[PDB]
């Protein structure tokens, strides 16, 4: 999650706090996951080989 989030605390009652996103700065690219294209292709190749049996 490239964003630099800023957690903010809200006192909703005696002793109880609610943690809220007050501000968001930094890299605003959407959260993502990277899987190596070469490694995933050869892993599906192994899965397919064992799946044709």
């Amino acid at each position, epitope marked *: 999650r490239p964003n630099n989030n800023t957690r903010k605390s809200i006192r909703i009652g005696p002793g109880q706090a609610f943690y809220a996103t007050g501000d968001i700065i930094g*890299d*605003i*690219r959407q959260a993502h996951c990277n899987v190596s294209k070469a490694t995933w292709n050869e892993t599906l190749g192994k899965v397919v080989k064992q799946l044709r049996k």
Partner: antibody
Amino acid sequence: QARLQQWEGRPLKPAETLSLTCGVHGVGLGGSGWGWIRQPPGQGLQWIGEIDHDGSHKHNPALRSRLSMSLDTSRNQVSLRLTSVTAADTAIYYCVRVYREKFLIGEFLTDYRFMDMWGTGTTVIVS
Amino acid sequence: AIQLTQAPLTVSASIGDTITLTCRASQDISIWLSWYRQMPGKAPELLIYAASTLRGGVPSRFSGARSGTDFSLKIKNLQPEDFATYYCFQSDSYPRAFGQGTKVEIT
């Protein structure tokens, strides 16, 4: 009608505590950050220090361990407590509001602080 | 820290001219550089923030440019209220710094 008012503290003896106070009207201490800017006579401006929106105290490296600032949220006042004042500290002290606007570079979002609102001036002379 | 170099330290022009002020930074401070004008005896006021955005109320004559190292400010249609000392202030690194100050006067 939003203004920052600060009043003269009169000349002070050398090697003492420099107590400043800025009056914030029109707006309040919350959300922005509040700092201090000086100006020695016949010279340019100098950054002393600021408190940012987070409540975190940025201080100038030149003034080491003699800096201390506080915010009076109840009275809407910003305080400066420079200690061990030397003759070189004779300058007009300004109270400023470092306002945060977010500017979007190609992919990066930043909080940009740009001293929106300036005080009137407190001529501090030590002799 | 970052050192801002502002030259020329004294530029003179008559009413109704165009001047360009230069503020050179040490490192690359992106576009975070604001401009302040100090009328003699008064308090400094914000003209331009982020090196390009005009403050609310500043006339459209004032304008900045550049997002690298050689920041510039251009004044058009000079008026007596523009003959003051201008300062460039960076906001990239927390050891904040000001410019030396360009005193604009009449010839």
